[PDB]
Amino acid sequence: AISSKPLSVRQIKGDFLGQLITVRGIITRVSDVKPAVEVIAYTCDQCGYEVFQEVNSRTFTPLSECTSEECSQNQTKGQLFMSTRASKFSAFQECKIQELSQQVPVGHIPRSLNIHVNGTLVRSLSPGDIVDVTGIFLPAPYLLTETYLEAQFVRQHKDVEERVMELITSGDVYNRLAKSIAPEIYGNLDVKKALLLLLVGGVDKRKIRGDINVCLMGDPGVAKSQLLKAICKISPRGVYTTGKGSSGVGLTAAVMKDPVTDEMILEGGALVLADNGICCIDEFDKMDESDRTAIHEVMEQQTISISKAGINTTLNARTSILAAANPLYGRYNPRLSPLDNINLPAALLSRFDILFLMLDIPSRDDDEKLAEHVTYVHMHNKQPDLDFTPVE
Amino acid sequence: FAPDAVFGDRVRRFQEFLDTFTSYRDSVRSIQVYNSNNAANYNILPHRIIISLDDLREFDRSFWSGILVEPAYFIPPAEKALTDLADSMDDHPWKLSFKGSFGAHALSPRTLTAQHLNKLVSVEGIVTKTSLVRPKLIRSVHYAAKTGRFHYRDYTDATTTLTTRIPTPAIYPTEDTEGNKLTTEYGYSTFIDHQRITVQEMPEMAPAGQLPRSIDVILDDDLVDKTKPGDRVNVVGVFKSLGAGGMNQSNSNTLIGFKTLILGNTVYPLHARAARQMLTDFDIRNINKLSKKKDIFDILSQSLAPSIYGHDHIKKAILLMLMGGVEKNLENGSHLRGDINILMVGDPSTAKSQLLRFVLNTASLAIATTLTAAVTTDRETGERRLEAGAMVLADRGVVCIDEFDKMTDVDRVAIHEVMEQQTVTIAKAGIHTTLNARCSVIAAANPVFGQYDVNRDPHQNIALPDSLLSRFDLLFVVTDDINEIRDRSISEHVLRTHRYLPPGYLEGEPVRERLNLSLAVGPKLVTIPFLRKYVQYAKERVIPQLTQEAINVIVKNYTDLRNDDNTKKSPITARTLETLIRLATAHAKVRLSKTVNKVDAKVAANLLRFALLGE
DNA sequence: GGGGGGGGGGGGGGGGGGGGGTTTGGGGGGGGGG
DNA sequence: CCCCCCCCCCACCCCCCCCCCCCCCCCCCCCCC
């Protein structure tokens, strides 16, 4: 029964070596596939009788003299040459699994393990996967042995064109689908109705530029960040960012190393992941000059540019923008132009298809309407309003 | 003398010792039957016994001093006698461990000296540089392809044995004497866990103008991961030299000393100089009897931090955070956060940090800080690992953040995800994922320059943005009031503290640093355990439902706050409304009440109005 | 007068022995705040 | 517009190899048929 139990990585002790255990964790890194020799085939130059060496370790030493009876009986010291055509290779790949961040005891470093996977089971894993893996827990030559898990079986943790008619036949689907966008958020149905059109999109023709963009602006709060996150959930090919957030690969692209090792690579930011899709910029007012010129290049070329380390290149970034320009100094002055309240230049704002300024006005009547909605959602736990027909 | 001759006498003498003190035999059988029962129905205890050096002294002083001074000759026969005893019990090597009265062999990494080599020693210290656990090969088993026999080989190094034996150099044999090829058998082959830990001297003991010394303990199998970095520990083991020490002819420089170690026999963490509590019928009765009284929200909160002058509303708010609000997953699993977050702005020297101590020692699953999650790397890692910050570690727990004004930009930018989404997102090295960080936070902060200016906002006295400060449900400002009654009280407490004279010291005698190693011979306010048991019982027994009369008080108070002059102090908004719902729910959890009702909202709104507006 | 056998030189194989295999400070460039 | 900050960049076993020794083979010379 022991193979059935999913062990966390730090429960894998030395006594398990040789057993077909099952482990649980997150894959923090994955190798590119490379071939490994099962059997080397050598041709013999002076007799043509091939010979074979099987390999059963991380290293080997190649053969030199023809050991075959064809040469050996003739005492003919022929020379051996490796053939990749005739050698049997197997696909090899390595992945580093780490215990889940929740499993780490208080103060300990998260423990990790090498998984080796061979044959057709290769490229069943990817970084960020949370997964259960069966394998043989094994030593390797470094008395302290190196150790790894030989993977054997994997459990990842994670018609339509007829089925659309079920909603079409019910009618008024635009109004209802817009009302299905974040039903837990009060009112603002005209804004939701526009935000839906950004997912649906216009025409691109030849060029004619087809993406649709909206800026929300004005006082902080009013469930706006949740609305942007909800759009990222609802929409296909969506991504959520902030003007300073997503601070790893970033919203703005660059050439990069993997400084944990020594190689270099070019990789895209969020605006490339949002390609053929939609990007949501929270804290939009706070993004820097490189970020602003990045969204400029989305709107002006539908690309993001590279000009570094001898590489000049533009990466494709066809994408809708949803944006949230919350003002300076904590609150908008609700009778002024936005440029007296917002950091961003009006040039950038002019490229958006629509801009919605919304103010968090204290007004007893609208306060009670909003508060009745919020308190009802908290009280009832279901159907954030009636007759909205919230589609999943 | 040749040890092998007297080995039998030492075995039978330790067997007589084991018979004389039968509690060791009883412990051996207790371990065996526990392991048998865990095997019987699909946890395992180790083959280790802690023997008292006092018992062994009273039995045979000559054998006892042999164990202390010559463990390389006296431990192996004693462990052989123990193994024979365990084998004599009905249906693998057993190990010894030691406790008590080491005398001159009670040491620290400073006073551990070359005179002590190969003696049994106890070292008082602090753990640093815990290595990764590695499996160490000690027996390799091999099926012979044609011969049929299972050949094997045992292995030796300077750490696996208490006495010197020729090292066996880490090679698997692959051929029989007859030349037949061998296939190595994992599982049947035996590997022991192996770990190195660097015990540092306690810095309190280190004398004037000296760095703390340190030494490497070696730990095998069931002693591995007994401790983590920073643990104050007492280790017992044999102090040893190893290696060639530059006597080997490669080394022109022979001034280098020999490497030295302790081979560990036991690891005692010194936690003392309940995370989930037991509950007796007395506790069940008195918890429920107390819950029917009205002033519990005063008495329980005032039982927090009883040394603190004033700050009743702060203690009440702390109690509501400890009994925080209920989670709301709506339809489609749409998540809204029930947890509560608090921030104590103010002067230094106020109650803040001491309140964080009292909260930290009262709460459970509580993390001390002075964040989020990260992708990280270190000196020896040729690899990157995903790390948990305090909020991830406090998932469904609490975080205590002192000096929160000091936190750096990459942290503060990502705190928004904790505050809005109760989660944190990773965005580099292809680990694009999101982690649960569903905690209730209490933070404290100081002015960045000068004393706190009570006219200026928290956004102005401290560099933290208003768009960050506004995330917290409750935002207190505390200040060092110069009240003579308070000052008289705390002054006399501090004077009584500084008049303390330790036991048996003469008047004016200086306190000696020698202490802990020299003694290394091994108004109805409630108790904090009772308060813990009450909050545990509340979390254990109720999830209050939200009644409409509560809603009517809540919308009344929110729309009042959002249209009274309180608007001129703060732009009161939707976050304040859901905060009122959380705080009223928390007060229902104070009551243990099956529902939230109008009474809870009336308390919560008074506290929130005080916290934000001071009234 | 040619072929076998004896004796000496030269080359190749096999064995044995031996050696090698990250922190701290400083200047200059580049960007941001008063 | 000017100055300060902060960021970057840089300093014991096993294999290959070589040396030494011994045997075997091949050629030359002399004798026998």
Ligand SMILES: [Zn+2]
């Ligand atoms: Zn050949």
